[PDB]
Amino acid sequence: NAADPEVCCFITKILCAHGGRMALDALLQEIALSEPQLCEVLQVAGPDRFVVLETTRSVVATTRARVCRRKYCQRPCDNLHLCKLNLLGRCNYRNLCKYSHEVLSEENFKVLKNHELSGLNKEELAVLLLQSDPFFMPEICKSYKGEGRQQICNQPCSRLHICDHFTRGNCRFPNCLRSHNLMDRKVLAIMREHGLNPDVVQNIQDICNSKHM
Amino acid sequence: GIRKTRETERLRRQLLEVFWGQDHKVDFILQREPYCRDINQLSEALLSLNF
Ligand SMILES: [Zn+2]
Ligand SMILES: [Zn+2]
Ligand SMILES: [Zn+2]
Ligand SMILES: [Zn+2]
Ligand SMILES: [Zn+2]
């Protein structure tokens, strides 16, 4: 029974109730599975749901579910529909927002059932999407060509000097000169100004490193 | 259909009195069946989980 979807969502839920990452030892105190049983579930679910690191084993929660990026979306559309700015703690919105503030609306509940994620609350889903969906990251600098070149870019630069393909999980090129390092001092400052603390950035880095393999 | 905040909270406090210290599991069951108002169906769904 290591493949059961219920046990996988419960692990995702605990990990996201504690910031999207937990040490294996701390996760074990909250779920009635022995260590080999929990290890089998993490292994069979794989890196598309759980990223395991030997830092002291640490577990990072992830998902393939994405939020709709349309300014105006005309159904049908099988992505989540929610206000992005609201999840980053920055939506000014009577509510005149044209994007859903009901995180667990009927439409979103159906999408969560497709990704075997029903059971998460609005806070746990926000933590999960923040480190998994690259739509929540700040803009990447388009004049940035790579390390040791072009005086960084034309410009402090308010945009990320990072590889765009790395953040979207598809940098399949050997001659890439662009940085895949999100834990840089300048990147963290830009991430923080946009709602992403360094713990969230380290989760994103580990998820992106996992996709890169 | 969909529960009110006071209905969910009353059901949560009742489930927590029975399943002490199982806050994540109680919430997990409340989110999986958000239309259910029966304390007994919600308790049997919680008991079915092998973890
Ligand atoms: Zn907990
Ligand atoms: Zn859409
Ligand atoms: Zn909004
Ligand atoms: Zn730049
Ligand atoms: Zn790259």
Numbering used by the authors:
A (entry chain A): 0 to 54, 61 to 98, 103 to 164, 167 to 224
B (entry chain B): 669 to 719
Text lifted from the article:
We expressed and purified recombinant forms of ZAP-X and the KHNYN CTD and used size-exclusion chromatography (SEC) to test whether the CTD interacts with ZAP-X. Mixing CTD and ZAP-X resulted in a shift in the SEC elution profile relative to either protein alone, indicating a species of higher molecular mass than either CTD or ZAP-X. To determine the molecular details of this interaction, we solved a 2.30-Å crystal structure of ZAP-X bound to KHNYNCTD. Moreover, ZAP-X interacts with a CTD surface opposite the linkage to the NYN domain. Additionally, a hydrophobic patch on KHNYNCTD, including Phe696 and Phe719, binds in a hydrophobic groove on ZAP-X lined by residues Val6, Phe9, Ile30, and Leu32 (Interface 2). Phe655 of KHNYNCTD occupies a hydrophobic pocket of ZAP-X, packed against Gly128. The ZAP-X/KHNYNCTD structure revealed a zinc-binding site formed by the two proteins, with the zinc atom coordinated by ZAP-X Glu29 and His17, KHNYNCTD His692, and a water molecule (Interface 3). The presence of zinc in this site was confirmed by zinc anomalous scattering. In our crystal structure, the KHNYNCTD has the traditional three-helix bundle structure of other CUE ubiquitin binding domains but the previous KHNYNCTD structure has helices of different connectivity, spatial arrangement, and length. Three single amino acid substitutions, at Lys12, His17, and Gly128, reduced or eliminated TRIM25-independent antiviral activity. All variants tested were expressed at similar levels. These results suggest that the KHNYN:ZAP interface observed in the crystal structure contributes to the antiviral activity of ZAP and KHNYN but is likely one of several redundant intermolecular interactions.
